[PDB]
């Protein structure tokens, strides 16, 4: 058995360096040589209590890509589930019992862990409030690996909302289980990387620094992970001032090295200008596409004792 | 009159934003040399001259009366910017509505007459 | 390789007579001798930004009938997509990635064209606002073909709202690419066939004429196309007065040619009377079903160089 | 004639120290020796585009308390107004016509200024987005005046969200037009009083200082102004951690000056504990009620040259 | 008694020339010399089952202007009235019995007539679907009278949607009870004045004609009644072509005679350009304001045996 | 090159809509005499010349190579109008989106590449 066979996928915290590496290596393998019957005669629950189109379709494609079927829902709007009095626990007990694996997304944190204690079948946390979204981080790791040929010894920059951006936190956390990545944090003072993430980085012996601008670090960077600067944590006057510093244009990448790739977990709105799309560094759309293969590999490894590739 | 020392690329913006091409009177423009504008048979105060200062920070404004210079206005930042720039505040009432944009000029900042928020001179352009 | 291979299907105006014939012929084989593996291991994106059940179930049935998988959604309100700042372009670019073809319906005119420019995979226009609905015309022509044994030299009555009836505009336009059809128009004075459609028909040497009643022309007609004469288009006193002479009943059909088929694109309320259903001419439900086989044909030709028997 | 006669009331920044004093003095006579005919045969338009019950009932009570009539609405959703293309300007111009004064609250900043330019009748700003809410400040100052017997040389604590608390910005600004107030600021590091407000206070020779706790400053304080420290402004772990030290309890007030009045603009959830209500310092409900008399004063001065006893 | 004392005001059809004249003459009288106690100790129901802000506030101002009080509602959204099973008849029976007069607006035609058969107290049709809105026509007649010194022998133009525009129909109908007005109809072919209105005009010996453009007739016109050209009765392509002909700018009135007044029942959107507002001919805002005095006079005449002016 | 016979008031629109003031190369403009434009050291096809025809229906386009005229292009209506005008159809997908406006030119009508609706040449301006 591979280390993930029959395991629940709840948090990036409980996935080791070795497991991450195997997941990305498996994504790469599956993308090169699809295995369209791996999940033959397997039925996969895909229960999105909270809408996530890009994620949901990403998963549903992966399942069906491997020969599996899909049951479930896409927003708890339509569902009659967990209405007035009924526990999520009960709901999961019933629906997981229909199926061979249980992909869920939920607005309450801890909801994938609870699921895993009431499903007799492996559960994949498609997202649980502000807590975890492992497959996003996994698709982000894969895309790095795909374009840098490794995950150790990389110069990664993170831009935008680093205080509340959960996708950067888990990614920094994942990469920090590998060797000698130096992180570069470019964000408003008011959205600096949080104190506790930084301690974890010290404890994982991993250099980080703060920079004022994107353009500053571009020539010494391999991966530029862009996130959105949301106006909620500011007002109008603040945003309109603080936004300008953290928008990525074609002009910003003029001194990029060739292997530079621009990532964004999407959606973008104006934090990456249109004119970056055609530049050789843009990889956000490929990143989105790599969501399918990342989720293929996880589903595969979870349900198949071996990948007889 | 004739406006000299205009930055190349911001000079086109003057013609548009100030509708200088509107009268019957002849108007001439040269781009890159710096941009430049000449305006045949029209008057302008030292007051109204300053509206321009926002776009061309250090620009000479000479005047023809009788085939040669008579006066040479140099521009300062005025108190007001009546309908030149839209307000960067998306929520501002100014937007869909039949009113003229307007900012007081205050660290060189622009303060919306309407929403009363305050923006850096650059963010307005 | 057939001319539609790897092509986008956006507009009836970009489909030629040969192509239209190829589609109805393919639709006939797939209906009569089905080929349930023609899209084995193909994943088809079905994205209905604007809800259209009849159409969506049709496509989704066609996809799976051919061995394909479906991903996508049924309206945009149930989605997390195209939110606030988020372009349609970005959304297409991502969901495209997931799929081998992209079927879409959208409230806005041109959305299928835009989609075709941001998708590396062939898009099928499921309907873009008031502009195009090609597969509707394709199922309409298939039904005519199937029942008439030809598309050339048929007598066709178009009845109802000819002015804003985008379905008739295309069907008329399409059959105008053929020989010898003579068109008969029955509408209120306020809902005549557009001047611009008539010029086309004149350019294409095709007989049309207007008539006061349906009964008047029945002896001469091979196909009767009923559209929906909506209440919006007048006030009450007008609708009540005008509706009478544009409703089809069984008695209307007393002098029908034995090959006469009544069509209606659905839905239908009072415009075709219930007693027509039992008659040998009612073909609107068969026509609706032919939506599956027309959309199969199109998906098939789009993705397979050649198609066998 | 008093300086406000026939004036628009849009911004606390356009009301002078004398005018502020005139308002609180007028508010005191109308509260203590009422004048129920001061707006006899006057019709006052109360238009709440954005719903604000506490404020609207306040104004509507003030209007009728003075002998006036009310017309208008409570939100825009219940309206047929400012529909699609229809300007706010047109709407003001028409409803203005109906009335002798126009009170309005609106979601957009500047809406009261715009209103004042399309109304031949004096508009009162009931609140325009994040910009101004003058009558809130006016009831705040009246309550301070009434309980303290002055507005000069008072010790004032401002507690909670000082950064985005538009009510404190104005109250601070207003009392800064007076002499010798010393301000005390108690907030999280992330919710400090704006740099720009502090410059004002410096321009106006007024002492301020920050403190870690409420208790710390109670012995020295005449007025305690509590704002609402909202959940939006951090994530969960942050809110939970920070909330503790910004909640007022009765025990907090053990060393109060006997003249200490606790204010809060309402609504209030956990930020002021229930046991404070019974204490001799609680004045938030009296303050809310003073909304009637401040808004009376303002309506009165606006429409009557002079006001007697 | 005046002819209207205790009468129901349902349709412009049952109000004679003499009654119209007295209403406008009374409006003029009340506007010159208000009578703020005419409706003293009178309670007036104002029940808007269908929202109409401009109308509702217009009425409510008038009532209160005359010393009366108001009870009721502004949209049937909030009401618990006429819910599942309960008749309008019952509802009216109860609410009218609270009150001395019953102003209503309703989405179903005939609703004011029904009201009048279940109210023991006079009812004023504030609008009943596409049937009648008498007080609009009355405020339109008043504004004409006010600015032309009469209602006979006037050249009136009507612009826009004359097919479905109910406000032009009743106005044409009202003016047609007077002597020697010549009407001028400027509208799209597709929205010509209806056949039946025109017959009524022939029967009232009243010259009308059709013109292509506004500008054509301007110098020979005293009143230019503008209405909105709604895009419903067209599609996008139609509207965008047909709109241009029926927009009124400052440039259009260059050859106006001095007594020309531009009326619009409001809201305008773009059928009257902004730049008309400042021109001497604009009277739509004054027209809106005159809604109060028109409704004052009707209410007065209905409830008071004489106006002891 | 130099563009002659341009209507007075529609000539300013050319500079804006075609971004002629964009290169380092010198550009000169005279309003009212008719507007006129001269463009120092830049090439233009007989193809691209026609894009302009929409705004100045009957306008001479001469070319300087060597201080004097070499060729004199006169304009016809081209087949296409790539991003010049926005589509008058409010519902059109073109509007919020990262695409270039485009019309085929057909009674002189303009047909949207995207929504496929058809507008009179004037309604587009
Ligand atoms: Zn503003
Ligand atoms: Zn378009």
List b or e across D285-305, with b for residues whose CB sees 16 or more CB atoms inside 10 angstroms.
eebbebbbbbbbbbbbbbbbe
Strands D101-106 vs D43-48: parallel, antiparallel or unpaired:
parallel
Sign of CA dihedral E43, E49, E51, E52: negative
Flag whether residue B10 sits within 8 Å of chain A, measured between CB atoms: no
Q: Do F13 and F64 fall within a single domain?
A: yes
Distance CA F69, CA C108 (A): 49
E106 tagged catalytic: no
Q: Do B63 and B32 fall within a single domain?
A: yes
Output the six-digit token pair for C302: 């789009």
- Assess whether the previous peptide bond of E306 is cis (omega < 30° from 0): no
The chains found to touch F (3+ Cβ pairs under 8 angstroms) are B, C, E
Spacing of C-alpha A182 from chain mean position: 20
Distance CA E292, CA E276 (A): 23
Output the six-digit token pair for A121: 């079948």
Tokens 């104004």 found at? D59
Q: Which helix (H) or strand (E) holds C185?
A: strand C182-186
Q: Do F43 and F101 fall within a single domain?
A: no
Q: Do F13 and F61 fall within a single domain?
A: yes
Name the residue of chain A whose CA is nearest to D164's CA.
Answer: A235
Residue from D71, D86, D120 whose CB has the most chain E CBs within 10 Å, to mutate: D71
CB contact under 8 A, F31 and B30: no
Of C87, C109, C196, the CB nearest to F114: C109
CB contact under 8 A, F112 and C110: yes
Angle between helices C134-148 and C166-175 (to 10 degrees): 50
**Looking at residue D231, what DSSP letter applies?**
G
Spacing of C-alpha E199 from chain mean position: 22
CB contact under 8 A, A237 and B119: yes
Q: Which residues contact D125 (CB under 8 A, 6 or more apart)?
A: D9, D10, D11, D104, D112, D132, D133, D134, D135
- Assess whether the previous peptide bond of A267 is cis (omega < 30° from 0): yes
The domain spanning residue F98 has which CATH number? 2.30.30.20
Contacts of E235 in chain C (CB under 8 A): 130, 164
The domain spanning residue F66 has which CATH number? 3.30.70.140
Output the six-digit token pair for C53: 């059940």
Output the six-digit token pair for D51: 């719903």
**Looking at residue D306, what DSSP letter applies?**
S
CB contact under 8 A, C109 and F97: no
The chains found to touch D (3+ Cβ pairs under 8 angstroms) are A, B, E
Nearest to A125 by CA among A141, A105, A142, A110: A105
Sign of CA dihedral A123, A126, A132, A133: positive
Q: Do F20 and F64 fall within a single domain?
A: yes
Name the residue of chain F whose CA is nearest to B27's CA.
Answer: F31
Following CA atoms E208, E213, E217, E218 in sequence, which dihedral angle do they give, to the nearest 10 degrees? 130
For chains A and B, tell me whether 3 or more CB atom pairs sit within 8 A of each other: yes
The backbone region for D41, taken as left when phi is positive above 0, alpha when psi lies in -120 to 50, beta otherwise, is: left
CATH architecture of the domain with range A133-290: 3-Layer(aba) Sandwich (3.40)
Spacing of C-alpha A230 from chain mean position: 19
Q: Using what technique was this structure determined?
A: X-ray
8 Å CB contact between C133 and C111: no
Q: Do F83 and F71 fall within a single domain?
A: no
8 Å CB contact between B61 and B72: yes
Q: Which residues contact B80 (CB under 8 A, 6 or more apart)?
A: B102, B103, B104, B105
Sign of CA dihedral A178, A181, A186, A192: positive
Residue from F91, F92, F93, F115 whose CB has the most chain C CBs within 10 Å, to mutate: F93
Task: Locate the DSSP E strands across A143-287.
Answer: 155-159, 182-186, 208-211, 223-226, 261-263
Name the residue of chain B whose CA is nearest to A242's CA.
Answer: B123
Output the six-digit token pair for F15: 């500079």
Name the residue of chain D whose CA is nearest to E69's CA.
Answer: D69
CB contact under 8 A, E240 and F118: no
Tokens 């000056």 found at? D257
8 Å CB contact between B52 and B1: no
Distance CA D296, CA D101 (A): 12
CB contact under 8 A, D128 and B93: yes
CB atoms within 10 A of CB F83: 12
**Helix, strand, coil: what percent of chain D each, to 5?**
45, 15, 40
D113 tagged catalytic: no
Same fold across C1-132+291-309 and C133-290: yes
8 Å CB contact between E65 and E36: yes
Active site residues of C: 54-55, 84, 105, 133
CB atoms within 10 A of CB B104: 15
Q: What is the largest CA-CA distance in chain B?
A: 50
CA dist E105 to C152, E11, E50, F98, Å? 58, 13, 6, 47
Output the six-digit token pair for A157: 């920059």
The backbone region for A160, taken as left when phi is positive above 0, alpha when psi lies in -120 to 50, beta otherwise, is: left
Residues in chain E: 309
**Looking at residue B80, what DSSP letter applies?**
B
Collapsing DSSP states into helix, strand and coil, what is residue D10? Answer: coil
Contacts of C190 in chain E (CB under 8 A): 190
Output the six-digit token pair for A276: 């970056």
Q: Do F64 and F121 fall within a single domain?
A: no
R_g of chain B computed on alpha carbons = 16
Output the six-digit token pair for D216: 């710390």
R_g of chain D computed on alpha carbons = 20
Contacts of C94 in chain A (CB under 8 A): 54, 266, 285, 288-289
8 Å CB contact between D170 and D134: yes
Say if residue E163 carries a ligand binding annotation: no
8 Å CB contact between D135 and D298: yes
Cα of C196 to nearest chain E Cα, Å: 12
Output the six-digit token pair for C109: 């005119």
| N-term to C-term CA, chain C | 15
Cα of C235 to nearest chain E Cα, Å: 7
Nearest to F119 by CA among E246, E159, E244: E244
Domain boundaries, given as residue ranges, for chain D: 1-132+291-309, 133-290
CB atoms within 10 A of CB A208: 18
List b or e across A168-197, with b for residues whose CB sees 16 or more CB atoms inside 10 angstroms.
bbbbbbbbbbbeebebbbbbbeebebbeeb
Output the six-digit token pair for A214: 């994107």
Q: In chain B, which residues are followed by a C-to-N distance beyond 2.5 Å, i.e. a gap?
A: 33, 106
Cα of D23 to nearest chain A Cα, Å: 31
CA count, 13 A, side-chain hemisphere, A301: 24
CB atoms within 10 A of CB E50: 20
Q: What is the largest CA-CA distance in chain E?
A: 59
Q: Do F60 and F91 fall within a single domain?
A: no
Cα of B117 to nearest chain A Cα, Å: 7
8 Å CB contact between E88 and E35: no
Output the six-digit token pair for D204: 């106006």
Q: Which residues contact F48 (CB under 8 A, 6 or more apart)?
A: none
Distance CA D287, CA C142 (A): 76
Q: Do B117 and B69 fall within a single domain?
A: no
Q: Which residues contact A69 (CB under 8 A, 6 or more apart)?
A: A42, A43, A44, A63
**Looking at residue C12, what DSSP letter applies?**
G
Output the six-digit token pair for D130: 């994040």
- Assess whether the previous peptide bond of A294 is cis (omega < 30° from 0): no
Distance CA D136, CA D139 (A): 5
Nearest to A246 by CA among A282, A192, A300: A192
Output the six-digit token pair for D254: 């053990």
8 Å CB contact between E287 and E142: no
Collapsing DSSP states into helix, strand and coil, what is residue A45? Answer: strand
Contacting D with CB below 8 Å, chain A residues are 130, 164, 190, 232-233, 235-236
Q: Which helix (H) or strand (E) holds D148?
A: helix D134-148
8 Å CB contact between A48 and A126: yes
8 Å CB contact between A43 and A203: no
Distance CA D154, CA D140 (A): 14
Tokens 């589903």 found at? A299
Nearest to A293 by CA among A28, A19, A38: A28
**Looking at residue D45, what DSSP letter applies?**
E
DSSP one-letter string for A250-305: GGGGTT--TT-EEE--S--SSSB-GGGTTSTTB-HHHHHHHHHHHHHHHHHHHH-S
8 Å CB contact between A103 and A62: no
Tokens 């054509």 found at? E216
List b or e across C236-260, with b for residues whose CB sees 16 or more CB atoms inside 10 angstroms.
eebeeebeeebbbebebbeebeeeb
R_g of chain A computed on alpha carbons = 19
Distance CA D298, CA D24 (A): 9
Strands A155-159 vs A261-263: parallel, antiparallel or unpaired:
unpaired
Q: Could you say which ligand is closest to the alpha carbon of residue B110?
A: 1
Strands B69-74 vs B60-64: parallel, antiparallel or unpaired:
antiparallel
Distance CA A238, CA A231 (A): 8
Of E130, E232, E236, the CB nearest to C232: E232
D55 tagged catalytic: yes
8 Å CB contact between C252 and C214: yes
Of C73, C86, C97, the CB nearest to A267: C86
Output the six-digit token pair for E160: 């826009």
The resolution in Å comes to 2.8
CB contact under 8 A, B117 and A241: no
Tokens 């990403």 found at? A58
8 Å CB contact between F2 and B6: no
Distance CA D275, CA B98 (A): 52
Q: Do F55 and F2 fall within a single domain?
A: yes
| Distance of CA E237 from the midpoint of ligand 2 (Å) | 10
Q: Check D31, D56, D65, D105 and give the catalytic one.
A: D105
Residue from C104, C109, C132 whose CB has the most chain F CBs within 10 Å, to mutate: C109
Angle in degrees, CA E232, E236, E238, rounded to 5: 85
Q: Do B65 and B115 fall within a single domain?
A: no
Spacing of C-alpha E284 from chain mean position: 12
Nearest to A51 by CA among A74, A24, A19: A74
Which neighbouring-strand residues pair with C186? C159
Collapsing DSSP states into helix, strand and coil, what is residue C110? Answer: coil
Q: In chain F, which residues are followed by a C-to-N distance beyond 2.5 Å, i.e. a gap?
A: 33, 106
Residue numbers of the domain that contains F113: 79-125
| Distance of CA C130 from the midpoint of ligand 2 (Å) | 11
Report the 3 state secondary structure along chain E: CCCCCCCCECCHHHCCHHHHHHHHHHHHHHHHCCCCCCCCCCEEEEEECCCCHHHHHHHHHHHHHCCCEEEEECCCCCCCCCCCCCCHHHHHHHHHHHCCEEEEEECCCCHHHHHHCCCCCCEEEEEECCCCCHHHHHHHHHHHHHHHCCCCCCEEEEECCCCCCHHHHHHHHHHCCCCCCEEEEECCHHHCCCHHHHHHHHHCCCCEEEECCHHHHHHHCCEEEECCCCHHHCCHHHHHHHCHHHCECHHHHCCCCCCCEEECCCCCCCCECHHHCCCCCECHHHHHHHHHHHHHHHHHHHHCCCCCC
The number of helices, as runs of H, and strands, as runs of E, in chain A is: 10, 9
Of D109, D232, D235, the CB nearest to A130: D235
For chains D and C, tell me whether 3 or more CB atom pairs sit within 8 A of each other: no
One of 3.40.50.720, 3.40.50.1370, 2.40.50.140, 3.30.1390.20 is the CATH number of A1-132+291-309, namely 3.40.50.1370
- Tally the domains of chain F: 2
CB contact under 8 A, F32 and B24: yes
Output the six-digit token pair for E137: 């026509």
Say if residue E84 carries a ligand binding annotation: yes
Distance CA D302, CA D2 (A): 9
Q: Do F47 and F16 fall within a single domain?
A: yes
CB atoms within 10 A of CB F71: 11
D79 tagged catalytic: no
CA dist B58 to B55, B76, B121, Å? 9, 9, 15
8 Å CB contact between F35 and F28: no
Distance CA A170, CA A176 (A): 9
- Backbone φ and ψ for C175, nearest 5 degrees, come out as -60, -15
């Amino acid at each position: 058995a591979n280390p993930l066979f029959r395991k629940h996928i709840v948090s990036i915290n409980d996935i080791s360096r070795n497991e991450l590496e195997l997941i990305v290596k498996t994504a790469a393998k599956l993308k090169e040589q699809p295995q369209p019957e791996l999940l033959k005669n397997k039925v996969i629950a895909s229960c999105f209590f909270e809408a996530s189109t890009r994620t949901r379709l990403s998963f549903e494609t992966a399942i069906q890509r491997l020969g599996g079927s899909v049951i479930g829902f896409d927003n708890a709007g339509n569902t009659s589930l967990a209405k007035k009095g009924e526990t999520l626990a009960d709901s999961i007990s019933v629906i997981s019992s229909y199926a061979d694996a249980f992909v869920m997304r939920h607005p309450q944190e801890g909801a994938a862990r609870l699921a895993s204690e009431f499903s007799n079948v492996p559960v994949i946390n498609g997202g649980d409030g502000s807590n975890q979204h492992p497959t996003q981080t996994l698709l982000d790791l894969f895309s790095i690996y795909e374009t840098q040929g490794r995950l150790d010894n990389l110069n990664i920059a993170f831009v935008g909302d680093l205080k509340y951006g959960r996708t950067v936190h888990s990614l920094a956390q994942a990469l920090a289980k590998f060797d000698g990545c130096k992180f570069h944090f470019i964000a408003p003072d008011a959205l600096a990387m949080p104190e506790y993430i930084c301690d974890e980085l010290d404890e994982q012996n991993i250099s980080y620094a703060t920079y004022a601008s994107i353009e500053e670090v571009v020539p010494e960077i391999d991966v530029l992970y862009m996130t959105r600067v949301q106006k909620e944590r500011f007002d109008e006057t603040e945003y309109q001032h603080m936004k300008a510093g953290f928008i990525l244009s074609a002009s910003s990448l003029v001194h990029a090295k060739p292997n530079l790739k621009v990532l964004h977990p999407l959606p973008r709105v104006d934090e990456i200008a249109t004119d970056v799309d055609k530049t050789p560094y843009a990889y956000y759309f490929q990143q989105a596409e790599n969501g399918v293969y990342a989720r293929e590999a996880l589903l595969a490894l979870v349900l198949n004792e071996t990948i007889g590739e | 009159y004739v406006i000299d020392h205009i930055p190349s690329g911001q000079g086109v913006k003057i013609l548009k934003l100030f509708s200088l091409t509107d009268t019957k009177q002849r108007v001439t423009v040269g781009f890159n040399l710096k941009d430049l504008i000449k305006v045949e048979n029209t008057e302008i105060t030292k007051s109204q001259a300053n509206q321009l200062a926002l776009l061309a920070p250090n620009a000479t404004i000479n005047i023809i009366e009788n085939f040669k210079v008579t006066d040479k206005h140099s521009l300062t930042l005025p108190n007001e910017v009546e309908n030149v720039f839209p307000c960067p505040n998306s929520n501002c009432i100014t937007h869909g509505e039949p009113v003229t944009s307007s900012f007081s000029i205050k660290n060189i900042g622009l303060k919306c007459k309407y929403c009363e928020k305050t923006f850096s001179k650059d963010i307005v352009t």
